[PDB]
Amino acid sequence: AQYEDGKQYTTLEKPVAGAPQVLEFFSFFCPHCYQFEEVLHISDNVKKKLPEGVKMTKYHVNFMGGDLGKDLTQAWAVAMALGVEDKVTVPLFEGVQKTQTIRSASDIRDVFINAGIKGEEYDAAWNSFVVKSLVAQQEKAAADVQLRGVPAMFVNGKYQLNPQGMDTSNMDVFVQQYADTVKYLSEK
């Protein structure tokens, strides 16, 4: 075939029931994730090619960056709760990997303040059981697929994207291959 198991994707021997349709995992510590966000705009281009009736989910992971990694997962839960993902994603990436000005939970908080989220609102979310359960959801989704690497994308709890098996001569061509693969898996 043109799309073949083990080439553009792999199949989970252990499929996950009730999983999000399109589920992406990342870490603000993850160098390919940075590229996926700022250079390739993967999530955006996948969305543009997905059918109607499909929601996209993106979760942070704990296994990079130790203590700060966990803070970032909680902060991503805050961002999801307040719906401010598109305001903090870039400064969190750059603060961790480019300027390296994020070294503590307080530095993460600064990114949100600078993005216009009020202190009171951030701290209230940070300490909320709603955010606690969002952290729980992120961990549980990652645990279900026994995740040891990011960036990762899973379609219908069944298929895992395999970017290793795509062209990287050309960044644009890579993105379309990736997105077209998602669409194909989506329709499978």
Residue 73 β-bridge partners: none
Q: For residue 53, is it left (φ>0), alpha (ψ between -120 and 50) or beta?
A: left
Overall CATH class of domain 1-188: alpha beta
Residues 6+ apart with CB under 8 A from 129: none
| DSSP state at residue 150 | S
Cβ burial of 116 (10 Å; 0-12, 13-18, 19+) is exposed
**Method used to solve the structure:** X-ray
146 phi-psi bin (left φ>0, alpha ψ -120 to 50, beta other): left
Question: Resolution in A for the shown PDB structure?
Answer: 1.9
CB-CB contact of 22 with 182 (8 Å): yes
The conformational region for residue 5 under phi > 0 = left, psi -120 to 50 = alpha, else beta, is beta
Order of strands, sheet of 159-161, starting from the edge strand that comes earlier in the sequence: 9-11, 159-161, 152-155, 22-26, 56-60
Compute CA 39 distance to the chain's CA centroid, rounded to the nearest angstrom: 15
Domain boundaries, the chain: 1-188
